[PDB]
């Protein structure tokens, strides 16, 4: 897997954001996670956490996995990094997302995220509180 450049266009919610990738605007959906919708418990906190993480970053990167790069809704599917720190993992570690949507061929960082989730749970963070 390799990281590619991208620029924030706009935060949307916990696990989605608009980025410009290869000079084109695209909604990205975070691989391997599920944040609550804004209208749900921990939804706003999830949205706020990622927004801050990406808006504060000097460098956003996208990392496609080995399988599908686009979902059925035309969203990019990737691991997103903000100054070297993976947003997908950070959300899980804070108990602001669950490991979810783990399809074969796009699950390279599954164990890593599961590791993060187990630690969030032990700490009973946010969603596990
Ligand atoms: C994360 C992810 C979601 N999706 C699809 C599954 C769900 O379709 P359905 O809505 O039909 O169940 C939807 C959930 O996205 P949200 O969690 O953003 O709603 O996105 C993929 O197809 N691939 C993925 O890697
Ligand atoms: Ca969601």
34 is in an annotated binding site: yes
Domain containing residue 15:
4-128
Number of domains in the chain: 1
Q: What was the resolution (in A) of this experimentally determined structure? A: 2.0
Could you confirm whether 114 is annotated as catalytic?
A: no
Question: What method did the depositors use to determine the structure?
Answer: X-ray
CATH no. for residue 8?
2.40.50.90
Distance CA 53, CA 26 (A): 19
Three state DSSP letters for the chain? CCCEEEEEEEECCCCEEEEEECCEEEEEEECCEECCCCCCCCHHHHHHHHHHHHHCCCCEEEECCCCCCECCCCCEEEEEEECCEEHHHHHHHCCCCEECCCCCCCCCCHHHHHHHHHHHHHCCCHHHC
Of 13, 29, 38, 68, the one to substitute when testing ligand 1's pocket (max ligand atoms within 8 A of C-beta) is: 29
């Amino acid at each position: 897997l390799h990281k590619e450049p991208a620029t924030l266009i706009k935060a949307i919610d916990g696990d989605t954001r608009k980025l410009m990738y290869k000079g084109q605007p695209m909604t990205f959906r975070d691989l391997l996670v599920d944040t609550p919708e804004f209208n749900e418990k921990y939804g706003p906190e999830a949205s706020a956490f990622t927004k801050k993480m990406v808006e504060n970053a000097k460098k956003i990167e996208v990392e496609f996995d080995k399988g599908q790069r686009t979902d059925k809704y035309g969203r990019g599917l990737a691991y997103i990094y903000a100054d070297g720190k993976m947003v997908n993992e950070a959300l899980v570690r804070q108990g602001l997302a669950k490991v979810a949507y783990v399809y074969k061929g796009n699950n390279t960082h599954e164990q890593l995220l599961r590791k993060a989730e187990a630690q969030a749970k032990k700490e009973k963070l946010n969603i596990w509180s």
